[PDB]
Amino acid sequence: SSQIRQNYSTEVEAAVNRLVNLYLRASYTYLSLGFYFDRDDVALEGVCHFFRELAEEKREGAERLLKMQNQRGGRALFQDLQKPSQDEWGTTLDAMKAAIVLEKSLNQALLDLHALGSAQADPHLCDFLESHFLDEEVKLIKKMGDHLTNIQRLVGSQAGLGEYLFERLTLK
Amino acid sequence: SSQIRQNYSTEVEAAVNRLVNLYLRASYTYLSLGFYFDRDDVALEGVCHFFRELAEEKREGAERLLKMQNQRGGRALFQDLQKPSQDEWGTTLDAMKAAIVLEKSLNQALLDLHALGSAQADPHLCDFLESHFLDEEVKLIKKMGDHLTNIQRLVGSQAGLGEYLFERLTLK
Amino acid sequence: SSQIRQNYSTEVEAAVNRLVNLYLRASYTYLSLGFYFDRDDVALEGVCHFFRELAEEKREGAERLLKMQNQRGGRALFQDLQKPSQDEWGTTLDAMKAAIVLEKSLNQALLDLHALGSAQADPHLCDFLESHFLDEEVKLIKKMGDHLTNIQRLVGSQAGLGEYLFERLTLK
Amino acid sequence: SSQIRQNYSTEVEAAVNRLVNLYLRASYTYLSLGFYFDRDDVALEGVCHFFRELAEEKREGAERLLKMQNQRGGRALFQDLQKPSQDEWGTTLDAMKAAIVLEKSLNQALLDLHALGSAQADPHLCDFLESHFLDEEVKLIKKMGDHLTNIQRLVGSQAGLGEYLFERLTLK
Ligand SMILES: [Au+]
Ligand SMILES: [Au+]
Ligand SMILES: [Au+]
Ligand SMILES: [Au+]
Ligand SMILES: [Cl-]
Ligand SMILES: [Cl-]
Ligand SMILES: [Cl-]
Ligand SMILES: [Cl-]
Ligand SMILES: [Cl-]
Ligand SMILES: [Cl-]
Ligand SMILES: [Cl-]
Ligand SMILES: [Cl-]
C-alpha cells in the first residue's frame, strides 16, 4: 500500500469508490432529465438548464471524491454506470420529485460515509464531507423542496399554464 | 454560356431559380403574417416581430442563392410571386402551424436540390447548401416546434390569457 | 413521431444513440486515465491534465450529439455505461497507445454513421459530422501519433528519465 | 485558571504545548535541510527553496497553535528544542524521504490530538485542527509522495543528471 497512506481504512477507500459511482450515476440521470426537457414536444428551456447544471455539479462532486482518494493514497476503482431509472420524465413536477428522491439518496450515502469515518476515527474524511458535500446537499434539497411547493401551487390551478409560468419566472 | 461556368448543370441552374422564387414567396408570406399581428384587433407585438424577422431571413436566403447563381455562371430568372395562402392568419397557434408547414416545404426543396446536386456531382452546390441553409432550417424548425408546444400548453388552459403570456414572456 | 421530424431515419436515430454511448464511455475511460496519472506512485501531472481534458472533450461530443438528436426530432435513449477496459494503465506509452486505439474506434464509428447518412440521403447528418467531429478526430489522432513517436524516442533511451522529460517539456 | 477558559481540559492544554514543540522542531529540521542544499558542494537551489518554505510553514503552524492556546485560556509553556536528526542530508531522494517521515509524524500527532479532543468533547479544538492543519498535512504528504516518485524515476536512470533535472524542472 501507498507510501503516503495514513489512517485511511480499506472500508472508507471502498465506500469512497461506491460514492463516486453514485455521483456519476446521478450526473447521468441529470443529463437524461436535461435533454428530455429539450425535446420539441416538452420544450421547457429553464428546466433543461436547471438539470444540465446539476449534471455538472454531480460530475464535479465525483471528481472531488477521486482527487481526495488519491490524496489519501487510496485507489480509484470504476464500475459500470447503470442507466437512469426512466427514459421519459413526465411533467416538471414529476421530474422534480424524481430529483429530490435522488438527492436524498446521495445525502443518505454521504451521512453513511461520515458515520463510517467517525467509527474509523478518520477526521480528515469527516471534515472533507462536512466542508464540500453535506451543506451543499442540504441547500440543494431545500431549493428543490421550494420548487416542488411552487410547482404544486401552480399546477393545481391550471396545469399547462402553471408549468410555463414556473419555467419562465422561477427557472429561466 | 458563361466564360466562368464549370460543372454547373442546367438542371441545378433552373432549380436554383425555382428555390429563389420559394424563398421570396416565403418572405412575402411572413410579411403578411407580421402585419396581421400588428392589426389593432390582433395586437401581439412579439408575434409581429417574430414574423417580420423571418421575412428578412427568407429574403436574405434568396439573395444568397442569387449571388451563388452568378458566382457559378448561371442566369437569374424571376417569375411572378404568388400571394400568400391566407389574408388572415387566426391565432398565434394557427400562425405558427402555418409557419412550420411553410418551413418544412422550404426544407424539402433544399433536400431535393441537394439530391440533384449529388446526382450531378456538384460538390460546390452541396457544400453551399450544407453551409448556409440546411442547418439554419433545422434549427428554425426546432424553434418553431418548441413554440408550438408552449403555445398549445398555454391555450389549452385559457386561450386569450395563454396567448398574451406567450407573447409577453417568450417572444417579446 | 415528432411534428418537426423530416428526413430523419430510425436507423440514424438509433445509431446516434449508440454513438452517444461510445462518446460517454470514452469520456469515462479518459477520467480513469487522468486519475491514474494523479496517483502518488505515478505522479505525472501533465499526463493527468492531457487525459482529463480529453474526458471533457468527449463529454462535449456526446452533448452535441444529444442536442442534434433533439433538433432532428429523434429521441435520446441512454444505456448502461460499461466501465473502462483497465483499472491501471501502465506507462505513459501504454496509456497513449490505449488512447489512440480508443480514438480510432470512435473515428470508425463516425465514418460508419456518415456512410449510413449517405445511404439514407441525410445531408444534414453528413454536414453535422463533417463540421463538428471528423476533422476534430483526425487532428487528435495526428497529435497522439506525434506524442507516441516522441515517447518512444525517449523511453528507448532511459525509460524513467524519458517519461519525466516528455511530461515536463511536451505536456505540461 | 483563566476568566475565559471554558471546556478546555488540562490534557488538551498540555498536548497543544507538546505539538508546538513538534512543529518548532520540524521548522528547525527544515532550516537545516534548506541550508544543506545551499552548500557549494550540494548546490540545488530549488531544493533549498522547497525546504526553507516548509521551515516557514511549520513555524506558522506553531504560531497558530500558540494563538489558539491563548484564545482558549491555556498557558504556553516552551521546552528545549532538540536539534535535527542529521547534520548532512544526503541526496534529494534521501532528504525527501526524511521530510515525508517527519510530516507523517506531525500528522500522527495531529490525529492523536484530535482523538483527545473528541474524547474530551472539545469541538472547538476538533474544528481548529480540521480547518487549519489536517487537510494542509494531507495535501503536503501527497505532494511529497509525488516528488518521491518523480525523483526515484529519475535517479534510477542516471543519478546526478536526474537530480539536476528534478531541481530544474519540478522545483525551481
Ligand atoms: Au471523524
Ligand atoms: Au454533391
Ligand atoms: Au449525406
Ligand atoms: Au470534538
Ligand atoms: Cl483498513
Ligand atoms: Cl440498470
Ligand atoms: Cl447541363
Ligand atoms: Cl396564388
Ligand atoms: Cl426510417
Ligand atoms: Cl464491461
Ligand atoms: Cl481538565
Ligand atoms: Cl537530540
Coordinates of N, CA and C and ligand atoms in Angstrom, one line a residue, chain D residues 5 8-11 120, ligand 11:
Chain D
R5 N -11.6 30.7 30.3 CA -11.4 29.3 29.9 C -12.7 28.6 30.1
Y8 N -12.0 23.5 28.3 CA -10.6 23.3 27.8 C -9.9 22.6 28.8
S9 N -9.7 21.3 28.5 CA -9.0 20.4 29.5 C -7.6 20.6 29.7
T10 N -7.1 20.2 30.9 CA -5.6 20.3 31.1 C -4.9 19.4 30.2
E11 N -5.5 18.3 29.8 CA -4.9 17.3 28.9 C -4.7 17.9 27.5
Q120 N -12.5 14.3 25.0 CA -12.8 15.4 25.9 C -14.1 16.2 25.5
Ligands
CL11 CL -9.2 19.2 32.8

